[PDB]
From TrEMBL, chains A, B, C, D:
Keyword set includes Transmembrane helix: yes
The entry's keywords: Ion channel, Ion transport, Membrane, Transmembrane, Transmembrane helix, Transport
Membrane topology: Multi-pass membrane protein
Key word tRNA-binding present: no
GO CC terms of this entry: membrane
Domain Potassium channel: 10-79
Residues of the full protein shown: 21 to 110 of 114
Protein name, as recorded: Potassium channel protein
Transmembrane segments: 6-25, 54-74
Organism: Bacillus cereus (strain ATCC 14579 / DSM 31 / CCUG 7414 / JCM 2152 / NBRC 15305 / NCIMB 9373 / NCTC 2599 / NRRL B-3711)
Protein's cellular compartments: Membrane
Organism lineage string: Bacteria, Bacillati, Bacillota, Bacilli, Bacillales
GO MF term set: identical protein binding; metal ion binding; potassium channel activity
């Protein structure tokens, strides 16, 4: 499934970029920076906000450019990969 | 309505898993753990974040795997079960 | 536009119910209770969480039953009512 | 691509309006006011809430009127402008 892999690669790259940015500029531990990237792009959010003007501007751009991609990835992780499995049982 | 029941079962199982995980690893009361699972997977969020690295990693995986499912469930709870009722009045 | 009015009425009723519930059980001012209802059902969220077990259970049910409705309402407020206006200028 | 530009213009105007409102009434720095507008309309949210009744009422209206628009803009920024680029490599 190429599109799955493609959306996966772009998401991975997006999250790597976010992890690097927030670990460097906002000073988060790598794991916390990946968490922040993930909850931002899925719109889940969390209890902290960037506190540098650079972090705020980057987050604005990051959100606008990443939400669509991660939403597409979540969609296919659910429908091209998850739906079939569901049918694997509910029909004999 | 099979698909409704199926989405319902998978959602229940997802939420049970989350309740168990967050009550065990993050140490939340069962009710708070279910709340956290629910607001996470609907992307509503809340004022607390996991504070163990295990909780953060699990939440990343949980979000990615659960959002699609709960969104589908919410869709059908609204359209295969809620829309008809609406027509039950607005047309004689 | 009937469906607009219908989605509007159901949303109003949903928000009224939320305002009453959160002003009574969580003890919020009416305006804060309406804010909480609105940011919950649009998944925007805010910096506070219900602190009674009754408020948490109600919010779980409220979210599951209301998000679909408000999403439909937001969709039509944007497409059956907002899109035409946009065309009102960008084409002579 | 006209629709892209149109959605872009309406989004810019929406965000400008939010920046002005929150910098004036809630007293946020311009950059923080734009951040608040952006995380509100993308439903990402943040760790602060308006504290004037005027800010709460405006945010209710702002959300209802803006979410649809920004969602459409995010969609096209991802599909009319981002998808082609993706094909630019994954096919020779
Ligand atoms: Cs959120
Ligand atoms: K901050
Ligand atoms: K959200
Ligand atoms: K929050
Ligand atoms: K934390
Ligand atoms: K959302
Ligand atoms: K609380
Ligand atoms: K506040």
């Amino acid at each position: 499934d190429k599109e799955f892999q493609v959306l996966f690669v772009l998401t991975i790259l997006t999250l790597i970029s976010g992890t690097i940015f927030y670990s460097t500029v906002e000073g988060l531990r790598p794991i916390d920076a990946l968490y922040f990237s993930v909850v931002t792009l899925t719109t889940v959010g969390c209890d902290i906000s960037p506190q540098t003007d650079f972090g705020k501007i980057f987050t604005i751009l990051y959100i606008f450019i990443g939400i669509g991609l991660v939403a597409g990835f979540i969609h296919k992780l659910a429908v091209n990969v998850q739906l079939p499995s569901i049918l694997s049982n509910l029909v004999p």
